[PDB]
Subunit: 424 residues, 4 copies
């Protein structure tokens, strides 16, 4: 176990009575004019109000949100606040304060630009963060990146609190305080991983995702989803679809039905970059969780080809892997066509679940490297998906053992819709 001890500086509780902690934000709407503000108070319920103001207009406003609590076995939570700030200005720095009654803590964010064809934007890519010492340097590598991530795409497995006895939910609080130094100033877009399931019938905890869902809200109604575990957002030139690997996705189910309709609503003339997130990779040549993505892949892979998804990000495997553009959609049971082929309409599949978890890397690879795998390496690190314009985005991967400006893997993406050419 390489988890940071409870006394670590990154887990420190902010001073002052009922001081807000575990502050975290995410996009609150479909197009970027809104922000969910989230924090926890531990001494008393406190106010769910958020004071905020833009640098441009300097008028202090109040939004009012809602508080909630939960229990998990013998654990009882602090007071969890979720407040949505709406009708924000584009491309604008706002300041926001939480804890208006007790002790007040102040933060800030920048709204993205209005969606558009050539609007540039830099996405962090982080998966399977955890709270090990490895997790802490990955976060450091992200925040010190000269490419300056503006939003993190998070592909599942947050706190790993379920590894503890009875899923010791204090390790959710520590994770929230630890990640605050980033997510309180820029949105993370949440994907549900398997360590969020927390299905523990032995301790009478049988509602999947219960802790995760109380602590991390997503703007899922903004895209007509009926569940927080699959949803869409638009931000700058990107359309991002979040799927749930451990929800139902059979034909006719809510997630299947929502994805079918959502892929049809995508307007590549406004958001050229089509990004999909799921926890479990559909392409993966590591031994760890080899072929667990087969189920979802059979259901959705053809749809990713059809709609010319640019890239699919996943975690789950604790390592890094970048596919070639391939598909394996010709199979008809008896026709023998079960080998992935090069398909220039396919997305690139990237496994980036290597941000540290609890300190274990997945090293065992199937050998030789299969044709469908382009690059892979068992190192800790994080990714950046730097969109330049409608045709070009630059993806890079940074290792924890390198300098923060070093790119150990690096490739240009040519947009599938606006410039379809062999970017290999």
């Amino acid at each position: 176990n390489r988890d940071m001890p409870l006394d670590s500086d990154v887990f420190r509780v902010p001073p002052g009575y009922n001081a807000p902690q575990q502050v975290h934000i995410t996009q609150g709407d479909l197009v970027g004019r809104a922000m969910i503000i989230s924090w926890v108070t531990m001494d008393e319920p406190g106010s769910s109000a958020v004071r905020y103001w833009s640098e441009k207009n300097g008028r202090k406003r109040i939004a009012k949100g809602k508080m909630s609590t939960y229990r998990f076995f013998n654990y009882s939570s602090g007071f969890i606040h979720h407040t949505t700030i709406r009708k924000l200005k584009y491309n604008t720095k706002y300041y926001y304060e939480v804890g208006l009654r007790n002790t007040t803590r102040r933060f800030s964010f920048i709204t993205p630009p209005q969606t558009g064809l050539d609007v540039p934007y830099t996405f962090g890519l982080i998966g399977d963060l955890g709270q090990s010492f490895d997790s802490n340097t990955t976060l450091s590598h992200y925040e010190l990146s000269p490419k300056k991530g503006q939003t993190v795409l998070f592909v599942g497995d947050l706190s790993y609190a379920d590894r503890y006895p009875n899923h010791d939910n204090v390790r959710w609080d520590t994770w929230g305080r630890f990640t605050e130094r980033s997510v309180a100033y820029q949105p993370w877009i949440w994907t549900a991983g398997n360590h969020e399931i927390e299905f523990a019938p032995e301790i009478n905890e049988t509602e999947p995702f219960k802790p995760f869902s109380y602590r991390y809200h997503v703007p899922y109604e903004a895209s007509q989803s009926t569940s927080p575990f699959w949803y869409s957002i638009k931000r700058a030139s990107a359309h991002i679809i979040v799927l749930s690997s451990y929800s139902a996705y059979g034909r006719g189910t809510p997630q299947y039905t929502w994805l079918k309709k959502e892929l049809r609503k995508v307007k590549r003339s406004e958001t050229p970059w089509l990004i999909v997130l799921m926890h479990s990779p559909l392409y993966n040549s590591y031994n760890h969780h080899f072929m667990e993505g087969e189920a979802m892949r059979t259901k959705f892979e053809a749809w990713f080809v059809k709609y010319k998804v640019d890239v699919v990000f996943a975690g789950h495997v604790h390592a890094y892997e970048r596919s070639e553009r391939v598909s394996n959609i010709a199979y008809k049971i008896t026709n023998g066509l079960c080998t992935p082929v090069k398909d220039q309409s396919a997305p690139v599949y990237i496994t980036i679940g290597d941000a540290g978890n609890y300190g274990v890397i997945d090293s065992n690879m199937i050998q030789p490297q299969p044709e469908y795998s382009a690059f892979r390496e068992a190192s800790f690190g994080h990714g950046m998906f730097d969109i330049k314009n409608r045709t070009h985005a630059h993806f890079s991967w940074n290792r924890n053992q390198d300098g923060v400006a070093v790119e150990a893997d690096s490739v240009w993406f040519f947009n599938r819709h606006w410039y379809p050419v062999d970017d290999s």
Copy 2:
């Protein structure tokens, strides 16, 4: 299309003030000593009490249940009752009556024999019933069967009420009154199909399986399931595992985790017949819904082989198919091994979703007939799985266009644990 009109005889309301209607029973425990009695009253809530007594020891006892209601868009249900009778005697006729506060109605059932290695038992197989005129013929054929079925293994898609505007839930009620003449007297073991999902955010109805789960209860806690849409029961010599094609089944999910534990609890020296029910077939050589079952197959086929499941029954496809014993579990992305192969540890996959639905048959088939497919036909009908003992179970398929004693398809199942020979 061919759905029976609302004024059909099969849909008649039982007379009397608040007379119970849509009466139906199913196994109430793990081993067959309990029964869930269910019904609906339309005039007022009424009593959830059930009076019962055996034709033998004859003492009249009272079980008490719970009532509940639901709404669906602009539909308001009647008052739905579910009551469990426990501690029944094995292998005895009981009488039970419902509607004690006002109009009483009386029915009977016969508890199964205790579970055991060599206990014979006869299972009706019905899928995708619906309420078309074909639906009624299938049910007649089952009731007039010389085989004499004792329990219906129902592989999902019940009322087809979702085909109607706003899913007109009156068509649940009619289907309940139509099927009463069978399921009030012998258990139907319920599987959930895609027509039970009734996901309709356009009318703000977003809870999967809501009308079905209010109306049809299952003993799912008896097998430590956390959900009614997957569960297991034992009856005579059969261990029946019911799965939910339209719930989560990824690694670490409730259903995945439950099934993974459940197969370890199977004792073939106590129940040698291992039967799996699911709505969507894992092997299906018809064009309609072709390869829909692939996702669940990747997850569960290797377990079915590991545990030598005798048969997997499914509906969904509106036709009849019986596979060979095959598996397709050796694939590894790049090893190229993606062809089903004869495997005597594997189950036979039977598609039996041809009870009538709303009158339509699935006739277009993959050509040529793949080697994994033993027999297929686009006719309405039903199946019977007739366990003779620990080694032999006779499966027969009866067509609606045939006489009720006629088996258009017939095959001996040799038990995968006690007698695993080529069948």
Copy 3:
């Protein structure tokens, strides 16, 4: 049984698919800038959106509210909509529309003037309305009154649906359609009466006021009440306090606590007319329900004197009665001081529970008329509290058997804070 039959013209369903019916409004805030819009759709849920605009300007805005439903025994409601229009302009005609998805119906209201010392306003007084032919006559008299009532103060007992078998809640829907012609255009201020309680444990209905509270919302949180059945509103120059005779009011209970603080908040220099609404009369010389008000009188009478309430309106008794300014607050169990005395600091107690109910008047009164009873008469009718300014309000009582313009009883009120001179007739 003088209840109007089900096929009466007043119970007619508004035509068109899923047309909104039982449209009714009431004040939706403390000061008058808000309105709660309420209505029922029978065919499908429909939209809880309200389109509205000022006759002056004309900008057509939308307010979104919520739909709820209930069951009561073997009855199932339609789809009940409550939507609050906020931030409105004072003294201004607004039009509003409901049923925006399918069949639209349009109505209007006038927001009250801004609260102030001399702001005039006419309040109607109706209690125990019911749905009888007498009930129809009272409503007609109210709306045809030459002094135009601008808001109804309603002292409880609405539909008398609970008199029917299984409280046949269909009789709630008919009463909503019948009263629509008034309450859809001007707010009625709701008090909960004993016929709202609907405690029917024999048919497993044990939640008091369940039908009433689903159908009739009030802005109780605006006055920091925690319950719909007691709350305060301010309108024009009146501060109106609504109490619940059939809720707890023992010392330390929520209603007791709320009323205690609420009287401290009243400012007679911003709203001179202090009005109390309750169902059960504290002072009542009628035989029916004689002394049922003693328990609440015991708890609150002295507070009404202390804070110089101008008038207490009640119903419950199916007749009309106006009291002298009278108090009975000096009793100490053993001191013999149990008789009401003239007290110019006390309010007037008015029983106005004679709008019709199910067609029965309460005529058996105690004789001779006690010294505390000013005027009493067993006839169907309604009242008007016509505030002229900070010092003067005219109260009048109109009988059904009389013309619409004739006051059978009437009296000038001298405001207890601004003109505290004896005004005894």
Copy 4:
């Protein structure tokens, strides 16, 4: 504030992992064959099962109950268990054990005799107990009483936790542990006082009686009450009626309606002693809370007289008072009949809210002592209602300053139905 400090011995936590604390029992049915067993586990949910057996026959049985939790402002409760043991034998000592899964604790109780005309029984009377050092003394005097109480009638105001900042509900847990040494072995019959209202809108606690209602269950369903704050039990020769001073009692309200019908069910030929419990006294000659009972009095006094209630116990005033048998029911507003008069159908009204509370006594009395007041004294203490038979019960008031066998006041109650003479 004479409240005991948190490290006092009476607040000791039972040792051992998840040891049940705050164990307390009350009658679980109408007549005395059932017991509600309540306790709190702090380390994890634990099992709600209760193992119990009579000292007579060691046939160990299991009763299964229910667990609940609550929050109050920034306080989070432990795991609260309520389990009803039903179908017990009369007049029988039972053992019971809680904390089965982890640390077990064992207690006992003795069921009352079957209800009956001439069954003797001793009732402890305790009100406004709290947790001062005075409170601990009163509880000692009760448990040391030579008259040996068999059940406590508790007229309300339990923990006084609502005097602490934010009603510091730890002072509920501490009170449960302190009272356990009595109430784990014999029932206390709970009346809600005003310190149970805990209506605190400032800190967003607006639901009356929430902490109390979670921690202390009552068998209110057994008398067809729809609310735990009013209810009746029958025990030995007593029919006991608990009213809620701080709920609704206007005409038509649930409580009012309930009391009207419950009195009609009283059978003095089976329970000759008719006893009413309420928190706020209807007769009180103390300055503190003078005439707060008038409102309930105007509604209910004539009913008490009409049904010849033997005695009404209240608390609320932190002193002792015993009235004469008087009524004040002749008043008609204008007839001037407002003075209480002696009335041999009226109950005796006893204020017994002097068990200690937070260490304050109410000493200021109305002078001179009114005619309706028989005896009254501002001292801490408790009472005992000792039923001998259908005609006689002995009531005694024991002060904390006297020795445990000393009665500072004592009267014979002559049964209003069987023996109504001037007592």
